[PDB]
Amino acid sequence: RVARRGELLELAAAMFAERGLRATTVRDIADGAGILSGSLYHHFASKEEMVDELLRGFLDWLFARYRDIVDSTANPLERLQGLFMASFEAIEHHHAQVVIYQDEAQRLASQPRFSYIEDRNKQQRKMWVDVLNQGIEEGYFRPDLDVDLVYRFIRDTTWVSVRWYRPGGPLTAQQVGQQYLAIVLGGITKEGV
Amino acid sequence: RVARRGELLELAAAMFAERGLRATTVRDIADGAGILSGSLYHHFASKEEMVDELLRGFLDWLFARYRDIVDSTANPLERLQGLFMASFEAIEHHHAQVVIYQDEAQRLASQPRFSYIEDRNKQQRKMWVDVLNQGIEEGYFRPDLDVDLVYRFIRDTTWVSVRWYRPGGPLTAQQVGQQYLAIVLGGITKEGV
Known part of the structure; x- marks a missing residue:
């Protein structure tokens, strides 16, 4: 857990x-x-120390997943698909840590104890911008996308569902992520529309 | 303002x-x-009364916009496009009210003073689900979309950008909304990919 x-x-x-x-x-x-x-x-030693261990374990796990995904995929589309689904894996299996990060990370980040939060924030952005750029260059993604904005869209949509998702419910986080991903990739309009 | x-x-x-x-x-x-x-x-009479007037004026303005949009568009695609862009109009021109709603509405909604919050919440969901259903029925949208999930995706994406958007910046909220909308409609992948 x-x-x-x-x-x-x-x-x-x-x-x-x-x-x-x-x-x-x-x-x-x-x-x-x-x-x-x-x-x-x-x-x-303190509750601050508890949160530190929680957020460190969480980010170490998450960025290890990112690494494995980047290493094991063959093109930017496969890569983006894998990276996108990782947040929903986090929502399903590390829910408490995700919620704690969402609700506390921005505040904590100004304290020296939590300097790694901004480090990881930078690393995640570079990751997303790199896969988007390479996908546009190789022709998997639309050529005139505003990369910084699409990064924002993806960062927003990969984690925003934790605000309403219910862990005991019928839909799993994976199913939510698969549908969210489908829209990110292909939108809601029918071909020709 | x-x-x-x-x-x-x-x-x-x-x-x-x-x-x-x-x-x-x-x-x-x-x-x-x-x-x-x-x-x-x-x-x-109180700060509670101030917030009440703020949130009422905001929701009355917003749902009047929704009404005008629903009345003036010719098909579910045009309708969804208009309705989607209304949140970014709110972010640009009623920023304080949007932030107050985002940060306080869920808590306030349990108080009798703010019973209209849930009323409007229900009304907005019905609005989105109706336009999605009609768009799928008439063939503007993909046939096997999970309507409740797409509603969630749209509700998430229409308002989530207020968490990072900077009012004095280079991009306007309208430009952010136009790009967000483009992804919702057609995704990030090139045709054929």
Whole structure:
């Protein structure tokens, strides 16, 4: 789930995601785990340190996926398809971490503890802009796309569904991602329209 | 700008949008306008009442636009194009209200004062689902689209750009919306790909 310490991190993540980081105290977490605060402090020095481990594990997992996808695909279309679907994998299997990132990363990024957030932000943009540029150059994508805008569109659409997606529901995040991807690639209009 | 009272509402909206509703006091607003709190209370009974007037004026303006668009377009493709662009008109010219809605509407909606929020939420969904259904039936849109999912995609993409769009920048919201719309309609892949 989180991309004894691991069990505690899982519980803390769920609580952070549901209630918000700042609204969650160490006492809250310790009580949730049915343990004393002193015992929780045998695993983590602070709630800030907990979020740090959560976001690091999440981003390390995600950018490892990106790497594997980039390495294993044969052209920019295959690559973009794989990279696009990775966010929905994250939504399905690392939901708490995704929600925590969405809700807290921008605020946290100004603290030295979380300097890696902007590092990864830069790395992800370069990744997307590179695949878009290569896809336009080789003729997989429309030639007059505004690459920065399409990057924005993709960044928006790969993660925006976490705001409404329900984990226990009928549609899986994968199915949502496949349909979202279909629109990104081919739009909603019929050929000839 | 806001879709003497009007000037004060403008100032309050900007402050609400920038700092958040709950973080903004009446004293803050009155000080911003260079007036006593008692004088501000000659226009509004509470900050809750201010937000109510802001969100009502905004939704009334927006759904009037929707109405005009529905009435003046000849087919579901034209209709969807017009309706889609209306959010970017809102982002450009009613930015504070859009941000306030995005950041506060879900929380406020449970209060009786704001019961119209869910009413409009239902009305907007029905609008989108109706144009999508009619477009599929008449052959403007792909036949096997999951209408509820495409509604979600459109709702997500029509408003998500307000999270990063900069009002003073080079691209206008209209240009962002036109490119977003182009992808929604025809995707990023070249014909044949």
